[PDB]
Amino acid sequence: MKFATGELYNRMFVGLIIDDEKIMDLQKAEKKLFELETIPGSLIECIAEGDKFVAHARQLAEWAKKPNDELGSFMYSLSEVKLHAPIPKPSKNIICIGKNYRDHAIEMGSEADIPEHPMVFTKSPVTVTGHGDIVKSHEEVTSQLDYEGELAVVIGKSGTRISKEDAYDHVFGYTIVNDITARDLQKRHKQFFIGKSLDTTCPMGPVLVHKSSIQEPERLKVETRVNGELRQSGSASDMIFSIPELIETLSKGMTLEAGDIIATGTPSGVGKGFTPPKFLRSGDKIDITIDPIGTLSNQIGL
Amino acid sequence: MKFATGELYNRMFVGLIIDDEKIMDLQKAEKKLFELETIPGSLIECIAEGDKFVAHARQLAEWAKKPNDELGSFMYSLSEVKLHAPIPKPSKNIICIGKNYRDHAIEMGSEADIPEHPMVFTKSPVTVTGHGDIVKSHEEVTSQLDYEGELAVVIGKSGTRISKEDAYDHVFGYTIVNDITARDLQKRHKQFFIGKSLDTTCPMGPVLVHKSSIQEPERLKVETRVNGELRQSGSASDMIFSIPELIETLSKGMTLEAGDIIATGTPSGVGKGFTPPKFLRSGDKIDITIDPIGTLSNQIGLE
Numbered sequence: 001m002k003f004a005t006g007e008l009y010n011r012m013f014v015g016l017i018i019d020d021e022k023i024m025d026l027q028k029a030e031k032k033l034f035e036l037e038t039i040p041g042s043l044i045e046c047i048a049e050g051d052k053f054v055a056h057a058r059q060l061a062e063w064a065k066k067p068n069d070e071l072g073s074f075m076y077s078l079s080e081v082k083l084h085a086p087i088p089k090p091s092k093n094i095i096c097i098g099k100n101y102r103d104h105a106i107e108m109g110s111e112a113d114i115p116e117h118p119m120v121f122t123k124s125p126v127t128v129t130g131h132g133d134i135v136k137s138h139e140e141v142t143s144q145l146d147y148e149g150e151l152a153v154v155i156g157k158s159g160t161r162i163s164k165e166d167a168y169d170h171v172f173g174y175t176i177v178n179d180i181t182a183r184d185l186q187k188r189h190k191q192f193f194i195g196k197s198l199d200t201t202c203p204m205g206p207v208l209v210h211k212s213s214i215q216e217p218e219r220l221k222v223e224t225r226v227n228g229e230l231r232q233s234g235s236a237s238d239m240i241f242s243i244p245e246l247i248e249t250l251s252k253g254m255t256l257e258a259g260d261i262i263a264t265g266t267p268s269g270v271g272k273g274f275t276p277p278k279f280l281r282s283g284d285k286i287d288i289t290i291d292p293i294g295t296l297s298n299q300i301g302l
Numbered sequence: 303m304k305f306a307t308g309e310l311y312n313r314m315f316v317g318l319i320i321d322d323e324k325i326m327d328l329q330k331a332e333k334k335l336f337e338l339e340t341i342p343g344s345l346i347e348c349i350a351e352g353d354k355f356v357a358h359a360r361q362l363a364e365w366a367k368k369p370n371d372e373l374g375s376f377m378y379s380l381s382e383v384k385l386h387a388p389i390p391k392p393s394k395n396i397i398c399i400g401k402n403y404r405d406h407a408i409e410m411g412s413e414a415d416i417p418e419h420p421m422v423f424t425k426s427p428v429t430v431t432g433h434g435d436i437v438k439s440h441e442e443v444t445s446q447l448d449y450e451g452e453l454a455v456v457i458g459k460s461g462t463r464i465s466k467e468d469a470y471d472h473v474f475g476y477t478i479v480n481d482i483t484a485r486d487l488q489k490r491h492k493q494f495f496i497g498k499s500l501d502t503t504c505p506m507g508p509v510l511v512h513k514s515s516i517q518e519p520e521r522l523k524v525e526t527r528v529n530g531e532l533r534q535s536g537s538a539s540d541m542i543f544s545i546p547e548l549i550e551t552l553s554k555g556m557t558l559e560a561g562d563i564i565a566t567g568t569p570s571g572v573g574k575g576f577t578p579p580k581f582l583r584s585g586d587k588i589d590i591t592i593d594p595i596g597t598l599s600n601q602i603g604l605e
């Protein structure tokens with residue numbers, strides 16, 4: 001169950017990946033197969049409907065593989081579809097965790113500055129972009145752009161005061177995020193927001209995998225490649241605060257709403273961590289891979 | 303000229319204050335005066351429309367001073383209407399400036415930290431609440447809940463890399479914000495977001511005054527009272543980083559969009575400024591007054 005927001009012939013649509021290299025237009029499929037119109041037009045609204053939307057989508061895929069002659073209405077080959085971020089316009093800023101991998105904390109010069117409590121900041125929705133999109137280099141405000149491959153969690157059911165025991169029941173699914181950061185701007189304003197919120201600096205996608213397809217988030221692996229070179233490799237089992245601990249902490253006095261996006265922190269290997277620091281430049285290709293979500297690819301603009 | 307989001311008969315509506323005793327339901331007013339329905343149902347959508355919305359609103363105001371068979375179908379007493387926050391659901395987190403009054407920086411930490419560049423963080427949209435609404439104490443999370451009266455600026459026109467010269471051209475207007483903060487969580491999580499983003503901890507309002515009505519905001523003045531006792535009195539000319547400088551800084555690598563809210567920093571006098579520390583408790587009544595916007599009033603709730 002992989003969901004996406006695709007664009008094809010001037011139509012933005014909520015899509016479900018069929019068998020890899022095909023994508024189903026859920027609204028159009030519902031009208032032709034189920035004769036009805038009940039699927040909303042954005043993925044964040046579908047997430048609000050929770051499990052019943054997901055099951056509705058599976059039934060639609062099942063009926064579509066059954067013989068019929070309407071497939072041309074709603075079956076698109078992925079090669080012909082531009083994938084936006086699964087949630088192109090979040091309702092709120094992306095919630096981000098800092099220094100959630102021990103090695104990355106050390107990398108930024110700490111081992112004393114390993115947080116004992118989640119360090120949490122946000123990225124403005126104006127940073128959100130999709131698979132294959134060009135990230136503005138922002139040469140004018142910074143010469144220290146950095147990449148951050150991260151696993152992202154999307155809340156699928158609202159709640160406050162959520163226990164770590166109930167946390168996964170408030171999760172819709174998982175996607176990839178590149179937390180692109182201006183390291184100089186990060187120091188300048190002392191709060192991470194401005195250096196984390198430059199335009200286009202949050203690639204997200206390529207798809208949003210429902211949690212029912214990832215039973216063990218602990219085993220996911222994040223791999224970041226810059227110009228083909230492996231530079232990050234981290235296991236979600238090694239992050240200091242687990243996803244249920246993060247949800248319990250984030251929601252202690254704050255309501256998490258369906259569609260909220262949580263970036264759980266990048267592993268070691270970021271560009272600033274190299275002696276002879278490696279910063280991003282125009283033309284750098286960035287590939288982040290988390291199976292079974294896929295690979296999120298972006299280029300820094302030239 | 304003051305816009306608001308009111309509620310009457312289980313319907314939220316964009317409203318215009320008339321003579322500070324009445325509020326005009328712009329949608330219903332357009333309906334029985336021109337028999338068209340073009341005015342959007344949210345203030346942030348109206349802000350996105352540009353000066354044509356403000357002009358249409360002026361026109362509806364005038365056409366109604368005109369004799370009325372059913373003025374009451376779109377004109378209401380403010381006494382009978384509940385005011386929500388002017389923007390009840392921001393499209394993004396509220397942008398907040400830290401340490402913008404020199405005497406507030408000194409009362410929270412020393413001089414050594416005052417910023418040479420704006421220190422900027424945010425409050426989650428779930429923080430927004432309205433004039434007269436009850437603010438949750440969140441006692442099972444914090445006991446260091448503090449008050450911050452601030453002037454808020456609302457962006458009326460999308461822009462990136464706005465020069466300080468063109469900044470006011472991108473402003474819709476002004477409102478009051480209470481940046482209620484949990485001081486301990488602020489320290490615990492080291493980044494301000496968690497301590498600043500507890501449910502109901504950003505009262506906003508009571509109205510949004512269009513910039514045309516407030517040409518000189520250097521002369522605005524923020525007064526905060528807790529249970530009747532005056533505790534904050536700042537002048538907007540005392541800000542490090544004026545409104546135009548803030549807009550130029552924020553928008554330089556980042557698009558500011560219509561409806562975006564910028565809290566410009568609280569002045570001296572917060573509860574943590576007190577040596578035996580003050581801290582809000584249940585039943586505390588906080589009033590923040592900025593004229594011409596009005597007074598924003600909220601009460602801390604029970605545990």
Ligand SMILES: O=C([O-])C(=O)[O-]
Nearest residue numbers: 097098099100265266
């Ligand atoms: O600070 C961050 O953004 C992180 O740790 O991923």
Ligand SMILES: O=C([O-])C(=O)[O-]
Nearest residue numbers: 399400401402567568
């Ligand atoms: O830091 C703050 O929130 C302020 O000074 O207004």
Ligand SMILES: [Mn+2]
Nearest residue numbers: 148179265266
């Ligand atoms: Mn990050």
Ligand SMILES: [Mn+2]
Nearest residue numbers: 450481567568
């Ligand atoms: Mn503040």
